[PDB]
From Swiss-Prot, chain A:
Quaternary organization: Component of the RNA polymerase I (Pol I), RNA polymerase II (Pol II) and RNA polymerase III (Pol III) complexes consisting of at least 13, 12 and 17 subunits, respectively. Pol I complex consists of a ten-subunit catalytic core composed of POLR1A/RPA1, POLR1B/RPA2, POLR1C/RPAC1, POLR1D/RPAC2, POLR1H/RPA12, POLR2E/RPABC1, POLR2F/RPABC2, POLR2H/RPABC3, POLR2K/RPABC4 and POLR2L/RPABC5; a mobile stalk subunit POLR1F/RPA43 protruding from the core and additional subunits homologous to general transcription factors POLR1E/RPA49 and POLR1G/RPA34.
Gene Ontology biological process: regulation of transcription by RNA polymerase I; transcription by RNA polymerase I; transcription by RNA polymerase II; tRNA transcription by RNA polymerase III
Entry GO CC: cytosol; nucleoplasm; nucleus; RNA polymerase I complex; RNA polymerase II, core complex; RNA polymerase III complex
Protein name: DNA-directed RNA polymerases I, II, and III subunit RPABC5
From Swiss-Prot, chain C:
Free-text note on domains in this protein's UniProt record: The C-terminal domain (CTD) serves as a platform for assembly of factors that regulate transcription initiation, elongation, termination and mRNA processing.
Native source species: Homo sapiens
Family: Belongs to the RNA polymerase beta' chain family.
Protein name (database record): DNA-directed RNA polymerase II subunit RPB1
Protein modification: The tandem heptapeptide repeats in the C-terminal domain (CTD) can be highly phosphorylated. The phosphorylation activates Pol II. Phosphorylation occurs mainly at residues 'Ser-2' and 'Ser-5' of the heptapeptide repeat and is mediated, at least, by CDK7 and CDK9. POLR2A associated with DNA is specifically phosphorylated at 'Ser-5' of the CTD by CDK7, promoting transcription initiation by triggering dissociation from DNA. Phosphorylated at 'Ser-2', Ser-5' and 'Ser-7' of the CTD by CDK9 (P-TEFb complex), promoting transcription elongation.
Disease note: Neurodevelopmental disorder with hypotonia and variable intellectual and behavioral abnormalities: An autosomal dominant neurodevelopmental disorder characterized by profound infantile-onset hypotonia, developmental delay with poor speech, delayed walking, and impaired intellectual development. Additional variable features include feeding difficulties, dysmorphic features, and visual defects.
From Swiss-Prot, chain D:
List of residues that carry N-acetylalanine: A1
Organism: Homo sapiens (Human)
Lineage: Eukaryota, Metazoa, Chordata, Craniata, Vertebrata
InterPro entries, sorted: NA-bd_OB-fold, RPABC3
Cellular localisation: Nucleus; Nucleus, Nucleolus
Region named Non-specific ssDNA binding: 15-39
Gene Ontology MF term list: DNA-directed RNA polymerase activity; single-stranded DNA binding
Function, in words: DNA-dependent RNA polymerase catalyzes the transcription of DNA into RNA using the four ribonucleoside triphosphates as substrates. Common component of RNA polymerases I, II and III which synthesize ribosomal RNA precursors, mRNA precursors and many functional non-coding RNAs, and small RNAs, such as 5S rRNA and tRNAs, respectively.
PANTHER family linked to this entry: DNA-DIRECTED RNA POLYMERASES I, II, AND III SUBUNIT RPABC3 (PTHR10917:SF0)
Keywords: Acetylation, DNA-binding, DNA-directed RNA polymerase, Nucleus, Transcription
Protein name: DNA-directed RNA polymerases I, II, and III subunit RPABC3
Keyword Transcription: yes
GO cellular component, one term: RNA polymerase II, core complex
Single Gene Ontology BP annotation: transcription by RNA polymerase II
Swiss-Prot record, chain H:
Record protein name field: DNA-directed RNA polymerases I, II, and III subunit RPABC2
Quaternary structure (record): Component of the RNA polymerase I (Pol I), RNA polymerase II (Pol II) and RNA polymerase III (Pol III) complexes consisting of at least 13, 12 and 17 subunits, respectively. Pol I complex consists of a ten-subunit catalytic core composed of POLR1A/RPA1, POLR1B/RPA2, POLR1C/RPAC1, POLR1D/RPAC2, POLR1H/RPA12, POLR2E/RPABC1, POLR2F/RPABC2, POLR2H/RPABC3, POLR2K/RPABC4 and POLR2L/RPABC5; a mobile stalk subunit POLR1F/RPA43 protruding from the core and additional subunits homologous to general transcription factors POLR1E/RPA49 and POLR1G/RPA34.
Localization in the cell: Nucleus; Nucleus, Nucleolus
Single GO term (MF): DNA-directed RNA polymerase activity
Task of the protein: DNA-dependent RNA polymerase catalyzes the transcription of DNA into RNA using the four ribonucleoside triphosphates as substrates. Common component of RNA polymerases I, II, and III which synthesize ribosomal RNA precursors, mRNA precursors and many functional non-coding RNAs, and small RNAs, such as 5S rRNA and tRNAs, respectively. Pol II is the central component of the basal RNA polymerase II transcription machinery. Pols are composed of mobile elements that move relative to each other.
Lineage: Eukaryota, Metazoa, Chordata, Craniata, Vertebrata
Gene: POLR2F
Length: 67, 50, 151, 148, 259, 101, 115, 79
């Protein structure tokens, strides 16, 4: 759906790293490089960004029920 | 030991003897028991009706 | 739903009253899953408990008289043993003899019969664990186990 | 007082057939005076011992020279002269077996006392005249002391 | 029979985390301090949410949940606040809560990112963690024509109630880096990598056993979520535990003197 | 057990002075040796034991003695030893005729 | 629908008492302390401080059930020393120990900043 | 007049007697023992059983059709 606000295990704020992570992946940083470029050292926090899937974009593709 | 023949010696022991036994595939308990040299006391058949 | 049937269930079908089954004159309940494994590791010969760890474990005994036993080792520092505490768990004055799962067969024939190098003959005497390692064969549902004799 | 046994032993061997436990080991030791055998299980972590070492045993029914039959209860606070103050390694167990060389007619010549300290076993095997005060289901202290 | 004197020295101080060492104290005291860090330091987070309109693609409880997890900079206000259960005021007042508002509507054809910057607070000091290049916490994405309006209130609470009141991100805790007390037993000590705080040569795998040792030199690394400063988390935790023990002391003294 | 071993284990052999004096008090060894009524009763008890042995062998052609019975006699004996502090090193006090009667 | 409220773990209802004292009848100079709405955070530090007292024969703590929120502390003392004063002495030493630690910590943090 | 039944209370008889006496105590029947402040009829019934004061007799029906009447006090309580 959308990026979680906090890491489930650690509790570190990970909700503001998604847009930066995507931007770095555009620039040929690899994931192993982009993740620690953002300051995510514990693998519990790293798996959040690494395994997240963003379905909010597919939902926004549909027309709203209102206007 | 329960299929092996068990006797009692002169010193009151229970030595397990080993003797030949024959298992069959049919059942005709009467014509078998009434035969020479077959042991008529222990010969069982697994068929209750017979 | 009624007082008569309530009393009858209490006096006939309570769990503690159903420990031994008449099907095979063995106990039905037994120590199982991670207590059994933790008991075998806890009652081994080389298990020593400091004073604080013993005082915590005794805090979980319901049938304890409030008397701390004399430690098996006094002077270099006071150390208890797993057997020394499991003896406090055993109730009354129970006496039974069991063999561990890994007990070699030749051990009984030769010397060291009553002083087992492998700690593999369970001997409980006067309600106190003297020697041996408790396994499924000692606390399980087999006939003659420590719970069967206790019942 | 009360001293069930007193002698100086020498470690003739450490656990044969390998060690089965990493903290405790079995040692076989002999005697100089009484010429009797001991098999003792000891924890090496707090009291390490090596082959060929020489030590003194004092098996006693109590830790007091007064010979007052103590509680079997653990009391840390006691301002009494303890027999263990002069000793390094002190255990506490109960004798659970006494085997003999006796027969139907003649008495026992060689005795073997088995005593367990919380699961640590000891077999003391000598002549009947030395293992005299050992009685089954009795509480004893092994007081050991290593000496040069 | 008396208290021992412990000592502290800080090896790293940052706006993000404090790393320090405590000497000459019990294991239990160290563990309890580690425990109070996570559970029993008061902090401010939004707990009451009233939604006036929500045309987004996430349902009302999904947005209220995400809102709850947004950290708020509460450094000195949290001390002078009161628990909502303790305030004698009938309705929300400035002395027991902080009010937030959010009115965002997407009109242009570009996707609108509703982030924490859109939360308008009532107090100039209690604001989201993006106070002072980095982006901000993303709440929701809105398509053209969608909107959401909501009014929220922040209260004081600690971790024991809910994890949103947890001030710390990660509390690393260690003692006895080289296995001297041997509270843990390695079947093969060679395979185990050295700790950061270990002091051994490349050859030696673990320290020699000493039977007389006790756990000392506890190593802490307290990393903040951004709501409280890393250094003030520890001061608040120590004060809270001392106050907790003091309340128990008063209640026991009252009970004994009445007994 | 063997015919030689069965007899060795369950006869009351009352013709040995020292052997009997090893296990029994002094007030009882003289009674066993002197009184012939007691000796006759003991011989009769062994004859009953021999008869029971013959009956068991005909009941159980299978060698195994493992059986299922109401209350564990060996465990009760062990319990009695530990309750009364028997100390099986001194001569016994129980009169052998009290056992039979 | 059966989930208890979150604040159930630390809030006392009306009529409940924080700490209750019951004398132990099995052995002399023994006592049991029941603390409501507490967990290991408080029981463990109290027990460890008590074990330092030379005049305390026994000290232990337990939580009867994790779903319940109660602690039980058993204190046995040598006969010249009440368990109640042993408990209060442990508390008043732990408080002093924590206050000293906080003061040293704040001094160290001040010295870390340009010191 | 002659009694060939066991002199012990079977478990079933013990269960039914306790239940059916606790029911009478529930209905304001007089109590046979000096109870000590307890309020539960089952505890009171268990006390009257152990004190051997239950005013109930048991009619054991033999297979032939005859029957024997045993007072609660006349037979040994198994527990
Ligand atoms: Zn994490
Ligand atoms: Zn207010």
């Amino acid at each position: 759906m959308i990026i979680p606000v906090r890491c489930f295990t650690c509790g570190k704020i990970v909700g503001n790293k998604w847009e930066a992570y995507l931007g770095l992946l555009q620039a040929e940083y690899t994931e192993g490089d982009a993740l620690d470029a953002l300051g995510l050292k514990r693998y519990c926090c790293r798996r959040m960004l690494l395994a997240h899937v963003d379905l909010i974009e597919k939902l926004l593709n549909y027309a709203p029920l209102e206007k | 030991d329960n299929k092996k023949k068990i006797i009692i010696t002169e010193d009151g022991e229970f030595k397990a003897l080993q003797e030949w036994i024959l298992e069959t595939d049919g059942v005709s308990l009467m014509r078998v028991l009434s035969e020479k040299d077959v042991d008529p006391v222990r010969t069982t058949s697994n068929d209750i009706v017979e | 739903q009624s007082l008569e049937t309530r009393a009858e269930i209490q006096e006939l079908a309570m769990v503690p009253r159903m420990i031994v089954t008449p099907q095979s004159n063995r106990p039905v309940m037994g120590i199982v899953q991670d207590t059994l494994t933790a008991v075998r590791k806890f009652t081994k010969r080389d298990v020593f408990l400091e004073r604080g760890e013993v005082m915590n474990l005794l805090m979980f005994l319901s049938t304890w008289d409030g008397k701390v036993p004399q430690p098996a080792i006094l002077k270099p520092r006071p150390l208890w043993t797993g057997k020394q505490i499991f003896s406090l768990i055993i109730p009354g004055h129970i006496n039974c003899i069991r063999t561990h799962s890994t007990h070699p067969d030749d051990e009984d024939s030769g010397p060291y019969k009553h002083i087992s190098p492998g700690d593999t003959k369970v001997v409980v005497e006067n309600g106190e664990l003297i020697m041996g390692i408790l396994c499924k064969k000692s606390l399980g549902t087999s006939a003659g186990s420590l719970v069967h004799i206790s019942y | 007082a009360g001293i069930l046994f007193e002698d100086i032993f020498d470690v003739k061997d450490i656990d044969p057939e390998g060690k089965k436990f990493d903290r405790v080991s079995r040692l076989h030791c002999e005697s100089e005076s009484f010429k009797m055998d001991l098999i003792l299980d000891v924890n090496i972590q707090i009291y390490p011992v090596d082959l060929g070492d020489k030590f003194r045993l004092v098996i006693a029914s109590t830790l007091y020279e007064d010979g007052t039959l103590d509680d079997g209860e653990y009391n840390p606070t006691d301002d009494r002269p303890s027999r263990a103050d002069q000793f390094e390694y002190v255990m506490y167990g109960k004798v659970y077996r006494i085997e003999g060389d006796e027969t139907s007619t003649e008495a026992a010549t060689r005795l073997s006392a088995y005593v367990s300290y919380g699961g640590l076993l000891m077999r003391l095997q000598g002549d009947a005249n030395n293992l005299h005060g050992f009685e089954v289901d009795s509480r004893v202290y092994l007081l050991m002391k290593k000496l040069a | 029979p008396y208290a021992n004197q412990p000592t502290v020295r800080i090896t790293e101080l940052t706006d993000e985390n404090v790393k320090f060492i405590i000497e000459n104290t019990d294991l239990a005291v160290a563990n309890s301090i580690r425990r109070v860090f996570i559970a029993e330091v008061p902090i401010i987070a939004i707990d009451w949410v009233q939604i006036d309109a929500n045309s987004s693609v996430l349902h009302d409880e999904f947005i209220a949940h995400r809102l709850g997890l947004i950290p708020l900079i509460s450094d000195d206000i949290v001390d002078k606040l009161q628990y909502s259960r303790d305030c004698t005021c009938e309705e929300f007042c400035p002395e027991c809560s902080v009010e937030f508002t959010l009115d965002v509507r997407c009109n242009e054809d570009q996707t609108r990112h509703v982030t924490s910057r859109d939360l308008i607070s009532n107090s100039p000091r209690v604001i989201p963690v993006t106070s002072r290049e980095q982006d901000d916490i993303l709440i929701v994405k809105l398509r053209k024509g969608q909107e959401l309006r909501l009014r929220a209130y922040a209260k004081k609470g600690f971790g024991k109630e809910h994890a949103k009141w947890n001030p710390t991100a990660g509390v690393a805790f260690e003692y006895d880096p080289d296995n001297a007390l041997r509270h843990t037993v390695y079947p093969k000590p060679e395979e185990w990598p050295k700790s950061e705080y270990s002091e051994l040569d490349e050859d030696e795998s673990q320290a020699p056993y000493d039977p007389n040792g006790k756990p000392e030199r506890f190593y802490y690394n307290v990393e903040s979520c951004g709501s409280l400063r890393p250094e003030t988390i520890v001061l608040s935790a120590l004060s809270g535990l001392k106050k907790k023990l003091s309340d128990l002391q008063t209640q026991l003294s009252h009970e004994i003197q009445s007994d | 057990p063997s015919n030689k071993a069965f007899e060795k284990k369950f006869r009351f052999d009352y013709t040995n002075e020292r052997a009997l004096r090893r296990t029994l008090q002094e007030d009882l060894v003289k009674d066993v040796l002197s009184n012939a009524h007691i000796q006759n009763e003991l011989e009769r008890e062994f004859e009953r034991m021999r008869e029971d042995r013959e009956v068991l062998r005909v009941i159980f052609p299978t060698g195994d003695s493992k059986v299922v019975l109401p209350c564990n006699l060996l465990r009760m004996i062990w319990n009695a030893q530990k309750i009364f502090h028997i100390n099986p090193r001194l001569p016994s006090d129980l009169h052998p005729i009290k056992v039979v009667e | 629908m059966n989930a208890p409220p979150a604040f159930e773990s630390f809030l006392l209802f009306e009529g409940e008492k924080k700490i209750t004292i019951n004398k132990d009848t099995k052995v002399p100079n023994a006592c049991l302390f029941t603390i409501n709405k507490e967990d290991h955070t408080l029981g463990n530090i109290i027990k460890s401080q008590l074990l330092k007292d030379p005049q305390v024969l026994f000290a232990g703590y337990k939580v009867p059930h994790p779903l319940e929120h109660k602690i039980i502390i058993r204190v046995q003392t040598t006969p010249d020393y009440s368990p109640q004063e042993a408990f209060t002495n442990a508390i008043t030493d732990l408080i002093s120990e924590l206050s000293l630690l906080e003061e040293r910590f704040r001094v160290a943090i001040k010295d870390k900043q340009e010191g | 007049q002659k009694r060939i039944t066991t002199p012990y209370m079977t478990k079933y008889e013990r269960a039914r007697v306790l239940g059916t006496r606790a029911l009478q105590i529930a209905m304001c029947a007089p109590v046979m023992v000096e109870l000590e402040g307890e309020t539960d009829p089952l505890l009171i019934a268990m006390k009257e059983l152990k004190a051997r004061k239950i005013p109930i007799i048991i009619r054991r029906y033999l297979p032939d059709g005859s029957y024997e009447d045993w007072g609660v006090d006349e037979l040994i309580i198994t527990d």
